[PDB]
Structures are given as structure tokens and as C-alpha cells.
């Protein structure tokens, strides 16, 4: 059970850790989050009480180092940092725990939600989508644009998601125009799975990471990437049975976790209607179709 200590909380802020969140008051004696489950990536995220544009956070894995949060009054944000001195860090965490100035990661024992949302998500893949090689953790916010969005302005602060474009030479073999446009199996299986991702686990990892960035930061380009990766599977007549079965589970937990009131801005009507009702895979997502029909029958 790892710990991310906080130096202090000088400004009033809503702090998220994965799917949980709590309000911290200006100068409240809050010194961090303990009992964080080992074995998964985590995200710690912030929304300032004084300015909801400031919506941002850090992907990390406590197996990779000792991380803490410290407010920077110059840059005006809570920053993640690595403590290289193991003993100094153990001594900080021990003191704060003794004084019970830390919130406990509030996992219900029966509750597999976070595993289910991050099953394929790996910190080494995050660090390739979010490039800042001097850190072992990854900063994301509401406003960061994707490489794809930037093609259609600062490359150092971009989300390097795999570019998917249904009307590209990459997606369409010369002489198989109609076939490849109407059945994307070659694009899914040869170009993306065999070619670029190497396997379904890395493809699902990127899909799950895109969802989480869309949900936690309202990152619009992430939402575009999540929908494109769903649509590419649903628009393929030939998908391995294990991928369809896994996709149904992945989407079920994403739709289950989405705040009821954000369905209007986070769910694309065209993609979902096409994926559940028109596509090759219209009958392969039973769990997802049932939760969508019961939770969001308006969108459909």
C-alpha cells in the first residue's frame, strides 16, 4: 500500500485519486493519500475552487519511485515530484501517518472498478503518449491537444495517441477502396494490431487511457480517440472472439463509471448508434448494449 504525501494545500481544491474525490480547504492541514493499491497505474487530479479551467493531474505507478505533491505558487499548480532519498521519504510518510493528516484510498474490497478501467493500461505506454522523459509520471490537462488535432500547435505538450483516419491511404489499400472503407478488418488487424500496437492488449491500453483522460479532464481529443478506437473495431467484420468479449467488458465498466450528467458531452450519438445497432459487431456487445439502453436511452 503506497503513499503520495503532500507538502501542504495552500489553495482550496477538489483532489481526485482515480474515481474518488474530496474537497480540501485553503491551508487545510492535508498531507496526502495513503493505502494506494500496488499493481495498477493511478491518476491524482485537481480542480481549483477559484478557477475550474485549472483541471489537470498526474498518471503514476508507485512501483517506479517515491512521488509527492507540492504546490508551486509561481506556476499556480499542485506539482508531482520524485523524492530520490528513500529514507527522507519514509520519514515524511511515517510522521504524516502518525499525525493522521492523510486520506485513505477508499477501495471497497469487492470493488474491481479501477482494475476493470485500467486492465491494459501500462505506465510505459502512457509515457510514450505523454512525452516528458525526465519524469516517471505524466501530466495531462483539459486543454492538451492530440497530434491528430494539431495536424488539422506546441508539439512538446501534445497527446501522441496513434492517428486513426478512416479516409487515409493508411486505412485504404489501392484497389480495395470500397472493401476497406465498408469493412475495416485489414486496417484493424494488419495495419493497427500486427503493424503498430503489436497486440490487442496495447490497443485496449490506449483505448482505456483515452477514455480516462476524457472522463477525468474533459479532454476533447481524448474523447475523439476513444470513439475512433471503438468505431474501428465495430466497423470490422473480422475480429478475434477474445477481443470482442474483452471489448464488451471494457466498455461496460466505462459506461458504468461515467457521471450520469456528462453523457451529453462525453458520448458521440453517431458512433454509439452505429456500433450497437448498424455495425458488424451490433450483436457482439451484449453487456454494453444493456447498460447503455438502461442508463442512456435518450442518446440512442
Amino acid at each position: 500500500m503506497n503513499t503520495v504525501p503532500f507538502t501542504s494545500a495552500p489553495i482550496e481544491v477538489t483532489i481526485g485519486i482515480d474515481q474518488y474525490s474530496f474537497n480540501v480547504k485553503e491551508n487545510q492541514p492535508f498531507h496526502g493519500i495513503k493505502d494506494i493499491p500496488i499493481g495498477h497505474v493511478h491518476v491524482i487530479h485537481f480542480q481549483h475552487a477559484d478557477n475550474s479551467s485549472m483541471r489537470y493531474g498526474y498518471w503514476f505507478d508507485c512501483r517506479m519511485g517515491n512521488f509527492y505533491i507540492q504546490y508551486d505558487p509561481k506556476d499556480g499548480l499542485y506539482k508531482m515530484m520524485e523524492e530520490r532519498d528513500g529514507a527522507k521519504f519514509e520519514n515524511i510518510v511515517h510522521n504524516f501517518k502518525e499525525r493522521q493528516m492523510m486520506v485513505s484510498y477508499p477501495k471497497i474490497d469487492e470493488d474491481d472498478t479501477w482494475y476493470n478501467l485500467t486492465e491494459f493500461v501500462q505506465m510505459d505506454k502512457i509515457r510514450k503518449i505523454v512525452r516528458k522523459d525526465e519524469n516517471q509520471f505524466s501530466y495531462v490537462d483539459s486543454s492538451m491537444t492530440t497530434v491528430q488535432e494539431n495536424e488539422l500547435s506546441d508539439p512538446a505538450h501534445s497527446l501522441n495517441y496513434t492517428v486513426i483516419n478512416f479516409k487515409s491511404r493508411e486505412a485504404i489499400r489501392p484497389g480495395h477502396e470500397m472493401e476497406d472503407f465498408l469493412d475495416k478488418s485489414y486496417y484493424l488487424n494488419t495495419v493497427m494490431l500486427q503493424g503498430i500496437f503489436k497486440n490487442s492488449s496495447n490497443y485496449f491500453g490506449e483505448l482505456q487511457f483515452a477514455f480516462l483522460n476524457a472522463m477525468f479532464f474533459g479532454n476533447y481529443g481524448s474523447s475523439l480517440q476513444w470513439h475512433a478506437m471503438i468505431e474501428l473495431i465495430c466497423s470490422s467484420a473480422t475480429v478475434p472472439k477474445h477481443m470482442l468479449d474483452k471489448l464488451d467488458e471494457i466498455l461496460y465498466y466505462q459506461i458504468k463509471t461515467l457521471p450520469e450528467q456528462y453523457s451529453d458531452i462525453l458520448l458521440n450519438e453517431r458512433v454509439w448508434n452505429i456500433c450497437l445497432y448498424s455495425s458488424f459487431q451490433k450483436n457482439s456487445l451484449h453487456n454494453t448494449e444493456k447498460i447503455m439502453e438502461n442508463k442512456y436511452p435518450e442518446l440512442l
Binding site: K167, S168, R169, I172, P174, E177, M178, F181
Partner: protein, 237 residues
């Protein structure tokens, strides 16, 4: 963006463009079977690809053999149209390739965009104009070459005959669309107006009769009257 009533004049500027109409590519007769079910029989079709500035018509004849053993023909017809237009562009010297292709039907946009990926600088545009190019098969010489085809064939015509010697592209396109609109609304009445003075013939190398400037004015009047009549014969207005 969309070609409309606001940006019409762009059709007659010096940027090469083609209109593509796919409404006569897939053509059937519907009939009863012996068992009293319904079946279709395909007949020869054509792509209508037209330079509205020069009048150059690229009439690609679609022979019924194209359809043999294929499913979802109305969908395939859009893709075959896009394949043949992209083959026509590749066949033209670079300085003759269009800068824009305007499709008369929005369902052609994705098929043509996907076949033209090799040509990123050629703009594929829809139109808000309701153009009467479906009536191309009411022009006897175009109908004749399509129906007589025994194999895939491209035939080249100038749909304006020699009109550009005397009038602008703007006016020629206006004459063409009025003739085709009349032929679309009441073919029998339109053909009678065009071929009622036996002294005015169609040259061997032409599609339309050899009207003097004055006779074209009378003809154009008769076509407008036919279109309004049929609109009142129709609508109870």
C-alpha cells in the same frame, strides 16, 4: 463547401472542374417472374462527367456485365462511379486534371473522396443545386450509344455543340439546364418542341438542332412555358 445559388459564377472561371452525376449508372426494369415474384433486369448505364466551362462530356458507358454476380448494386454503383472518375482523372495529363469535382448527389462524396486519396489537392464538393443531369438519357444520341454498347466504353462529346462560338459558358450552361429540365418534366412535349420544324436538323457531329440565335430564343420560351404548365398541370397552383 457546397456549390449553391450564391457561388454559381465559379462554374465558368478558368479553374478546371467537372460535375459528376451517377443517376444513370445503375438502371433496371422491374418485372414479374413466372411464380408472380418481382425481379429486376439491369440495362446499360452511364456516368455523366461534364466540364461546365468547355462543354466536354466524358460519357463512361456502364455495361450490364459490371453487375454480374455482385450484391447491393445501388451501393456498388456509387463505388464503380468513383473508380471510373478516378481512372479518368489519372488518364488526363496533369494540366488537364480538374482542381474540383462537384457531385450532384451527396452519397457520392465518400466513395469519390476514398478513390481520390492519391489527389489530396482535388476538392470533392457537393451542391445545393437540383441539376437535371438525370435527363441525359433523353438526348437521343447519348441514349443510342449507351443502349448499343456491348462492352465498357468511354465516348467523348461536346454537350454545347458549337454554341460557345456565339455565347458565353454561363449562357450555354443555362440553355443546357433549361433543355434538360424540360426533357425531365415532360419528355414527349420537350422532344416535340425541339424536332417540330423539319427544316432545322441536327448535324452528324452535334446533339441538338442547328437553331439560329432567334430560333433559340423561341425554343427557350417554349421550354419555360412547358416547365410552368407542367408545374400547374401538377401542383394544383
Amino acid at each position: 463547401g457546397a456549390m449553391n445559388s450564391s457561388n454559381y459564377a465559379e462554374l465558368f472561371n478558368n479553374d478546371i472542374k467537372l460535375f459528376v452525376d451517377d443517376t444513370n449508372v445503375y438502371r433496371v426494369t422491374v418485372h414479374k417472374t413466372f411464380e408472380g415474384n418481382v425481379a429486376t433486369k439491369a440495362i446499360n448505364g452511364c456516368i455523366f462527367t461534364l466540364n461546365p466551362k468547355t462543354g466536354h462530356l466524358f460519357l463512361k458507358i456502364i455495361h450490364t456485365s459490371v453487375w454480374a454476380g455482385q450484391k447491393r448494386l445501388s451501393q456498388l454503383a456509387k463505388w464503380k462511379t468513383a473508380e471510373e472518375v478516378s481512372a479518368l482523372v489519372r488518364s488526363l495529363p496533369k494540366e488537364e486534371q480538374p482542381k474540383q469535382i462537384i457531385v450532384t448527389r451527396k452519397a457520392m462524396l465518400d466513395p469519390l473522396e476514398v478513390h481520390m486519396l492519391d489527389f489530396p489537392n482535388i476538392a470533392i464538393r457537393p451542391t445545393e443545386l437540383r441539376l437535371p443531369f438525370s435527363a441525359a438519357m433523353s438526348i437521343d444520341k447519348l441514349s443510342d450509344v449507351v443502349m448499343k454498347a456491348t462492352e465498357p466504353q468511354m465516348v467523348l462529346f461536346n454537350i454545347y455543340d458549337d454554341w460557345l462560338d456565339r455565347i458565353s459558358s454561363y449562357t450555354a450552361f443555362s440553355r443546357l439546364t433549361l433543355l434538360l429540365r424540360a426533357l425531365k418534366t415532360n419528355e414527349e412535349s420537350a422532344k416535340m418542341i425541339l424536332l417540330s420544324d423539319p427544316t432545322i436538323t441536327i448535324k452528324s457531329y452535334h446533339l441538338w438542332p442547328s437553331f439560329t440565335d432567334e430560333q433559340w430564343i423561341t425554343i427557350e420560351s417554349q421550354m419555360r412555358d412547358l416547365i410552368l404548365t407542367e408545374y400547374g398541370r401538377k401542383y394544383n397552383v
